């Protein structure tokens, strides 16, 4: 029948949310991606509203954890059983962290019988041998040995991350089942047009210790994921031409390629932080063919 | 045309605290004044009160810190979410995303030094009922666990986690000196036999025995949707229907007023029992004197 028109939310870069961590977006970055594998499992959705990988709709439940917790005796560590069918054809529980690193946050527990509440500094290492979210359990190191009760509802809320810039590695996927392979992964992403690179929506993660690599790049904003999921407009071409427009003056600053699979590319060469007006937004104009040459932007 | 997004209750986010919604509640509201300043938005996409669009930037705090010597407390001067200054000339009650209730909010204060990349994080709390809680003047105070670590002229973020609270009592945005200004109006059922419909979450607790119930008038996703679509209200009331997608059967109906709140036909407190896959659906525009069928 008649096609539903395609659209992108009218929002500036600083009004949208990063889809790989529950923080706002900060800038637009571009750089070569051949030296590393870009395969995030969050913020993955096709343009017609089909979620991929471990991507869901709620922007708060990113890198969060929920369940019941058992103390590892002799340590300040605790094991959380996740609340989960391992049979769903997904790489890991929805919202699982899709990068290797040490995430700091708060473990909060509630005791049902009377309403007691508890909170403690927790950390989870996604590259740890005891990080098996696909199997239904993860490990947190806390600051207590007796405070968290058994089989009480416990929530992990993330905050940030803990040789300089050797951690966290954002382009290295965790092993969801352990050390002895991942399944149902979203495809890796690379620009298949000469002179084109990926355009990353970049945020700065909060740091809690040391000298961490606080850059976090996502292919699609969370608001874009929610919008694509809602509208479910079919892709009439393989790539959709988006133009960055100034709403006051109407001047176009640059144009980009929005691929139907769910990533953006620009015509540039080299690492570059895009300088844009604070009120600029992305506007959809047309569906372009496979031979479309983007006008390059400095 | 007008519409509401096809989402279940448990898939949406509370607009007064960055946490997922949990249930639907309804009850009498005569014994308290319902005037929240977050999660307020007209149906044609006009934000009211201290409401903005980011669902993660609710109850957060950004700026620079100064140490109160002899204590573990700190004083943060506020910057807008774009890292610009908070301009108190803005005809808003307080910086957008400000907590709109009295209580102690626990969280983490994180700081980064620009030159070398040193980072620190510390347990912090902010009391919205305190004398030094004056966001409208561009200043808040934080109770920390350190007296030495946080530096000056360095960007600092406060991310909330939970409470240690009077949910329906607004803070004094400029302190105990002045009154609050440009408040979103209080809502109440103006039709006989009707009650308000609250989207209810349970706030995390980190100490003590706090009352963790938090009700919002609109889910944050509804606010984003209304702001994006900008559909003009053709009537005083928008008739919504909660529908089970498996069978198509209507569970109940409710009235979405153009100012931004929902009412149901009920009498007495009740936590609504709903199917997990149900969603709200817009059907038509009806007048204010439309009698809803009783809600189970």
């Amino acid at each position, epitope marked *: 029948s008649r096609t539903k028109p395609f659209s992108v939310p*009218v929002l500036t870069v600083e009004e949208m949310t990063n889809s790989r961590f529950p923080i706002p977006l900060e800038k637009l970055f571009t750089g070569p991606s051949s030296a590393f594998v870009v395969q995030p499992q969050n913020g993955r959705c096709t343009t017609d509203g089909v979620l991929l990988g471990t991507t869901q709709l709620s922007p708060v439940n990113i890198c969060t954890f929920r369940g019941d917790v058992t103390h590892i005796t002799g340590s300040r560590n605790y094991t959380m059983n996740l609340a989960y069918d391992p049979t769903e054809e997904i790489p890991a529980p929805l919202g699982t962290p899709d990068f290797v690193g040490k995430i700091q946050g708060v473990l909060t527990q509630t005791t049902r019988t009377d309403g007691s509440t508890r909170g403690h500094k927790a950390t989870v290492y996604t590259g740890s041998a005891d990080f098996a979210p696909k199997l239904g359990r993860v490990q947190f190191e806390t600051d207590t040995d007796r405070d968290f009760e058994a089989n009480q509802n416990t929530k992990f809320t993330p905050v940030g991350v803990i040789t300089h810039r050797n951690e966290p590695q954002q382009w290295v996927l965790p092993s969801y089942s352990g050390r002895n392979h991942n399944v149902h992964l979203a495809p890796a992403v690379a620009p298949t047009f000469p002179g084109e690179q990926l355009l990353f929506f970049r945020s700065t993660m909060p740091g809690c210790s040391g000298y961490p690599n606080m850059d976090l790049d996502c292919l699609l904003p969370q608001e874009w994921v929610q919008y694509f999921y809602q509208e479910a407009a079919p892709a009439q071409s393989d790539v959709a031409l988006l133009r960055f427009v100034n*709403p*006051d003056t109407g001047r176009v600053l640059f144009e980009c390629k929005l691929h139907k699979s769910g990533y953006v590319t620009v015509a540039h060469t080299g690492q570059h932080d895009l300088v844009i007006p604070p*009120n600029g*937004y992305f506007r959809f104009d047309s569906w372009v063919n496979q031979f479309y040459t983007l006008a390059p932007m400095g | 045309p007008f519409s509401v997004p096809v989402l279940t209750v448990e898939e949406m986010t509370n607009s007064r605290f960055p946490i997922p919604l949990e249930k639907l509640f309804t009850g009498p509201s005569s014994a308290f004044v319902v005037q929240p300043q977050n999660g307020r938005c*007209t149906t*044609d*996409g*006009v*934000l*009211l009160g201290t409401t903005q669009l980011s669902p993660v930037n609710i109850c957060t705090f950004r700026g620079d810190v100064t140490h109160i010597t002899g204590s573990r407390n700190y004083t943060m001067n506020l910057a807008s979410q774009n890292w610009n200054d908070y301009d108190p*000339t803005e*005809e*808003i009650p307080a910086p957008l995303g400000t907590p709109d209730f009295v209580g102690k909010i626990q969280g983490v204060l994180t700081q980064t030094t620009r030159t070398d990349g040193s980072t620190r994080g510390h347990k912090a709390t902010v009391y919205t009922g305190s004398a030094d809680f004056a966001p409208k003047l561009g200043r808040v105070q934080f109770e920390t666990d350190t007296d030495r670590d946080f530096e000056a002229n360095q960007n600092t973020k406060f991310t909330p986690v939970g409470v240690i609270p009077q949910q329906w009592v607004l803070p004094s945005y400029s302190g105990r000196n002045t009154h609050n200004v*440009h408040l979103a109006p209080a809502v109440a059922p103006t039709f006989p036999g009707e009650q308000l419909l609250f989207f209810r979450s349970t706030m995390p607790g980190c100490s003590g025995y706090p009352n963790m119930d938090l009700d919002c008038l609109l889910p944050q996703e509804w606010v984003q949707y209304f*702001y*994006q679509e*900008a559909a*003009p*209200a053709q009537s005083d009331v928008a008739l919504l229907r909660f529908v089970n997608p498996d069978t198509g059967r209507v569970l109940f109906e409710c009235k979405l007023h*153009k*100012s931004g709140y929902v009412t149901v036909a009920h009498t007495g407190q009740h936590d609504l029992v709903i199917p997990p896959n149900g969603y709200f659906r817009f059907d038509s525009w009806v007048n204010q004197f439309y009698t809803l069928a009783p809600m189970g």
Partner: nanobody
Amino acid sequence: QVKLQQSGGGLVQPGGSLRLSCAASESTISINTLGWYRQAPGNQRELVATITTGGTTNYADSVKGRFTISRDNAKNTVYLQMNNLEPGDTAVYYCNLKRRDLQSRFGGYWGQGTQVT
């Protein structure tokens, strides 16, 4: 969503005075900025006056002292009293409303221009 209706145009001769009015229509009255802009033949559109619900006024440096903006919240109406008019004031004067919605990013809401000669 928002409707604006202006009135008060005409022709004066140098040294004269006139008054424009603009009434707004909203489903729910908002905290907003009501103002006047103007565009001259072959010229860019420029600001002449704004006022908020709280009363904050902003004037263009060319019209300070001669032009006076006024507001009525209960009637949601903005008035512009232009005294000591210049031949350089011949232009189309537009009424503008800016509230906290998406449209505000594209310049707010506009009324039908009013010619001033």
